[PDB]
Ligand binder design. Structure first.
Ligand SMILES: C/C=C/[C@H](C(=O)O)N1C(=O)[C@H](Cc2ccc(F)cc2)O[C@@H](c2ccc(Cl)cc2)[C@H]1c1ccc(Cl)cc1
Length: 92
């Protein structure tokens, strides 16, 4: 549900986000929104930060996502995830 033009947007992650990404392998300083979310999901899957049916993202105060009235995300609310992300980076 997010335009391709917008999935292409090249961005630069702030320290907190960049650190999460690198923890999962990322090597660059800049990425496309698509790449950022891709690495975000990889973290989520590797840390199993999700509900039983993998329908909702569930994280803790102890993980890197928590660090990133706590926000709860559903895996299908694309827009909302993008918005939060937009706070953790600066466009290029
Ligand atoms: C808003 C962008 C979403 C976007 C996509 O849906 O295409 N998306 C992804 O591209 C990656 C891809 C992926 C999948 C498996 C894996 F091992 C490594 C990478 O993660 C996705 C995902 C989906 C469900 C769960 Cl429980 C966890 C991660 C999912 C996603 C990534 C981050 C967040 Cl907050 C929510 C959903």
């Amino acid at each position: 549900q997010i335009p391709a033009s917008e999935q292409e947007t090249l961005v630069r992650p702030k320290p907190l986000l960049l650190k999460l990404l690198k923890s999962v392998g990322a090597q660059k300083d800049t990425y496309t929104m698509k790449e950022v979310l891709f690495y975000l999901g990889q973290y989520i899957m590797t840390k199993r930060l999700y509900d039983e049916k993998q329908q909702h993202i569930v994280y803790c105060s102890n993980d890197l996502l928590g660090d990133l009235g706590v926000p709860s995300f559903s895996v299908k609310e694309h827009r909302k995830i993008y918005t939060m992300i937009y706070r953790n980076l600066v466009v290029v």
